[PDB]
Design an enzyme around this catalytic site. Structure first.
Site, PDB file in Angstrom:
ATOM      1  N   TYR A 138       0.808  -1.246   0.000  1.00  0.00           N
ATOM      2  CA  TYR A 138       0.000   0.000   0.000  1.00  0.00           C
ATOM      3  C   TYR A 138       0.853   1.316   0.000  1.00  0.00           C
ATOM      4  O   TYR A 138       0.314   2.381   0.273  1.00  0.00           O
ATOM      5  CB  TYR A 138      -1.012  -0.011   1.149  1.00  0.00           C
ATOM      6  N   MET A 196       4.740   3.581  -1.613  1.00  0.00           N
ATOM      7  CA  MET A 196       5.971   3.698  -2.394  1.00  0.00           C
ATOM      8  C   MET A 196       6.908   4.687  -1.728  1.00  0.00           C
ATOM      9  O   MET A 196       6.462   5.742  -1.286  1.00  0.00           O
ATOM     10  CB  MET A 196       5.643   4.101  -3.819  1.00  0.00           C
ATOM     11  N   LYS A 247       7.816   8.400   2.012  1.00  0.00           N
ATOM     12  CA  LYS A 247       6.880   7.320   1.757  1.00  0.00           C
ATOM     13  C   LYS A 247       5.495   7.841   1.487  1.00  0.00           C
ATOM     14  O   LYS A 247       4.885   8.458   2.359  1.00  0.00           O
ATOM     15  CB  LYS A 247       6.836   6.340   2.936  1.00  0.00           C
ATOM     16  N   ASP A 286       8.706  -7.217  11.966  1.00  0.00           N
ATOM     17  CA  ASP A 286       9.224  -7.486  10.626  1.00  0.00           C
ATOM     18  C   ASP A 286      10.684  -7.064  10.466  1.00  0.00           C
ATOM     19  O   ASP A 286      11.085  -6.443   9.478  1.00  0.00           O
ATOM     20  CB  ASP A 286       8.320  -6.868   9.559  1.00  0.00           C
TER      21      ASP A 286
HETATM   22  C1  EQZ Z   1       6.232   1.423   1.319  1.00  0.00           C
HETATM   23  O1  EQZ Z   1       6.917   1.158   2.532  1.00  0.00           O
HETATM   24  C2  EQZ Z   1       7.135  -0.215   2.777  1.00  0.00           C
HETATM   25  C3  EQZ Z   1       8.100  -0.324   3.919  1.00  0.00           C
HETATM   26  N1  EQZ Z   1       9.384   0.333   3.644  1.00  0.00           N
HETATM   27  C4  EQZ Z   1      10.084   0.102   2.379  1.00  0.00           C
HETATM   28  C5  EQZ Z   1      11.236   1.050   2.480  1.00  0.00           C
HETATM   29  C6  EQZ Z   1      12.298   1.284   1.623  1.00  0.00           C
HETATM   30  C7  EQZ Z   1      13.250   2.235   1.947  1.00  0.00           C
HETATM   31  C8  EQZ Z   1      13.162   2.994   3.125  1.00  0.00           C
HETATM   32  C9  EQZ Z   1      14.205   4.017   3.406  1.00  0.00           C
HETATM   33  N2  EQZ Z   1      15.301   3.856   2.649  1.00  0.00           N
HETATM   34  C10 EQZ Z   1      16.300   4.728   2.797  1.00  0.00           C
HETATM   35  N3  EQZ Z   1      17.381   4.541   2.026  1.00  0.00           N
HETATM   36  C11 EQZ Z   1      17.517   3.513   1.010  1.00  0.00           C
HETATM   37  C12 EQZ Z   1      18.020   2.222   1.626  1.00  0.00           C
HETATM   38  C13 EQZ Z   1      18.241   1.214   0.524  1.00  0.00           C
HETATM   39  O2  EQZ Z   1      19.194   1.699  -0.445  1.00  0.00           O
HETATM   40  C14 EQZ Z   1      18.700   2.896  -1.074  1.00  0.00           C
HETATM   41  C15 EQZ Z   1      18.471   3.995  -0.069  1.00  0.00           C
HETATM   42  N4  EQZ Z   1      16.337   5.761   3.641  1.00  0.00           N
HETATM   43  C16 EQZ Z   1      15.243   5.926   4.382  1.00  0.00           C
HETATM   44  C17 EQZ Z   1      14.149   5.082   4.304  1.00  0.00           C
HETATM   45 CL1  EQZ Z   1      12.786   5.440   5.307  1.00  0.00          CL
HETATM   46  C18 EQZ Z   1      12.062   2.768   3.967  1.00  0.00           C
HETATM   47  C19 EQZ Z   1      11.127   1.784   3.652  1.00  0.00           C
HETATM   48  C20 EQZ Z   1       9.889   1.370   4.354  1.00  0.00           C
HETATM   49  O3  EQZ Z   1       9.394   1.841   5.358  1.00  0.00           O
END
Ligand code: EQZ
Length: 345
Positions: free
Chosen positions: A26, A28, A44, A139
């Site tokens: 739900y 991106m 997000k 998780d």
């Molecule tokens: C839609 O939501 C689902 C659940 N998910 C997925 C997610 C992916 C990524 C980050 C995030 N990623 C990064 N940097 C990246 C790390 C990997 O390599 C490239 C940079 N920095 C801050 C955050 Cl919050 C947070 C979330 C999260 O909550």
């Protein structure tokens, strides 16, 4: 509004030049340039309002993370949404952008024993805080452990996080579960809803093992295969541990299996530090009541170079306990209220 991979990202003009990171059922995530603070950030986009379950999970995530403030936990720095419930179609949570995650790092880099130790320390330090607020992450996995170029580690993705509820942990055999399969404790498949803190310690155990070899310890291909993999290493549960499983379907399944002896940790991880495997053993205990707790893990000799309980803070305002029965439309109102503090007005 910019598109990113087909989704409107209604966050401009403050946040521009968006790049896709990832997603889920739900929402991106994008990186974006913050034209105020002059840094890139993570944003997000959450789109939960057509499903009660995603609304429940959105409210928990936001409510939990707004109460938390800790160095090893990803906070919420801003929340963008429309000024009225009517015009609110999505919610955008703005968070510190991190360079990488542990999943990507383990696919490309051998970790020294000092990096494993420091990473595990940071995981447990953040977890101590989460657990001290009476919250379960539920998780924990390498892709939810973010890192920067100086190896600071922050826990992210509270989408499945819940206030602990051990009195309602019991369920039947083969009850469906949403959290990532490879990091599920054995009891999930047997008799557990994943409502106690021991669920997260299992996941951390799995992460530690994966740090030692760069490979998931229990890569189950499907729901019951996950338990097969666990028991192949831990061996068959003892009579005492099996007697804690009162549900006959679960117990008789376990009794039907061929006997398996414990695989010693030093056999799977010949180059590992002996204190690391001693803690690994205590985290990967079959019986959740006997499994090590977060504060005891921090006190383990493997973490002696970092352990400092005076510098391992707990939550100022733990969660004291009902959004299970509420429809899509009322949870939207609660999400609107929970995010009101970030509005210009
Ligand atoms: C839609 O939501 C689902 C659940 N998910 C997925 C997610 C992916 C990524 C980050 C995030 N990623 C990064 N940097 C990246 C790390 C990997 O390599 C490239 C940079 N920095 C801050 C955050 Cl919050 C947070 C979330 C999260 O909550």
């Amino acid at each position: 509004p910019e598109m990113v991979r087909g989704q409107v990202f209604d966050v401009g003009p403050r946040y521009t030049n968006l790049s896709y990171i990832g997603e889920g059922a739900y929402g991106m995530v994008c990186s974006a340039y913050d034209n105020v603070n002059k840094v890139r950030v993570a944003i997000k986009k959450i789109s939960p309002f057509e499903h009660q379950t995603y609304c429940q999970r959105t409210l928990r995530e936001i409510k939990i993370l707004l109460r938390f403030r800790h160095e090893n936990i990803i906070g919420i720095n801003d929340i963008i949404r429309a000024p009225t419930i009517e015009q609110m179609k999505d919610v955008y949570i703005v968070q510190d952008l991190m360079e990488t995650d542990l999943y990507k790092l383990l696919k490309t880099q051998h970790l020294s024993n000092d990096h494993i130790c420091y990473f595990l320390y940071q995981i447990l330090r953040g977890l101590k805080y989460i657990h001290s607020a009476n919250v379960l992450h539920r998780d924990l996995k390498p892709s939810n452990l973010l890192l920067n170029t100086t190896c600071d580690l922050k826990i992210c993705d509270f989408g499945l996080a819940r206030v602990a509820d051990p009195d309602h942990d019991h369920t039947g055999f083969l009850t469906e579960y949403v959290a990532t399969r490879w990091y599920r404790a054995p009891e999930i498949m047997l008799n557990s809803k994943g409502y106690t803190k021991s669920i997260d310690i299992w996941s951390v155990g799995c992460i530690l093992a994966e740090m030692l070899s760069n490979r998931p310890i229990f890569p189950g291909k499907h729901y019951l295969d996950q338990l097969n993999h666990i028991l192949g290493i831990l061996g068959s549960p003892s009579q005492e541990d099996l007697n804690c499983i009162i549900n006959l379907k679960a117990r008789n399944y376990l009794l039907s299996l061929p006997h398996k002896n414990k695989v010693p940790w030093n056999r799977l991880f010949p180059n590992a530090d002996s204190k690391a495997l001693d803690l690994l053993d205590k985290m990967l205990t079959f019986n959740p009541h006997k499994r090590i707790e977060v504060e005891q893990a921090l006190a383990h000799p493997y973490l002696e170079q970092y352990y400092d309980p005076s510098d391992e803070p707990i939550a100022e305002a733990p969660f004291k306990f009902e959004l299970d029965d509420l429809p899509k439309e009322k949870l939207k109102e609660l999400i609107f209220e929970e995010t009101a503090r970030f509005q210009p007005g």
